[PDB]
Amino acid sequence: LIIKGI
Amino acid sequence: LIIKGI
Amino acid sequence: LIIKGI
Amino acid sequence: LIIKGI
Amino acid sequence: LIIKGI
Amino acid sequence: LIIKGI
Amino acid sequence: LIIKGI
Amino acid sequence: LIIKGI
Amino acid sequence: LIIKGI
Amino acid sequence: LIIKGI
Amino acid sequence: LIIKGI
Amino acid sequence: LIIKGI
Numbered sequence: 233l234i235i236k237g238i
Numbered sequence: 239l240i241i242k243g244i
Numbered sequence: 245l246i247i248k249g250i
Numbered sequence: 251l252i253i254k255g256i
Numbered sequence: 257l258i259i260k261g262i
Numbered sequence: 263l264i265i266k267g268i
Numbered sequence: 269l270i271i272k273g274i
Numbered sequence: 275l276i277i278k279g280i
Numbered sequence: 281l282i283i284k285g286i
Numbered sequence: 287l288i289i290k291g292i
Numbered sequence: 293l294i295i296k297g298i
Numbered sequence: 299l300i301i302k303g304i
Contacts, residue, residue, distance in 0.1 A: 288293075288298075289294040291293065
């Protein structure tokens, strides 16, 4: 799982 | 961005 | 599953 | 963009 | 399944 | 755009 | 452009 | 499957 | 551009 | 799978 | 750019 | 998996 913001 | 696998 | 924003 | 598989 | 916005 | 398969 | 095969 | 924009 | 295979 | 932006 | 394999 | 920004 990868979660990337700004 | 979300990338999800097993 | 890929979920991509702006 | 949403791309979903199994 | 592919769902593509603007 | 929606593209759906099995 | 969309090109779809199997 | 190929999906091409502008 | 989206290119998807197996 | 290749997804290419601007 | 996203490139995903196995 | 490769994810490339600006």
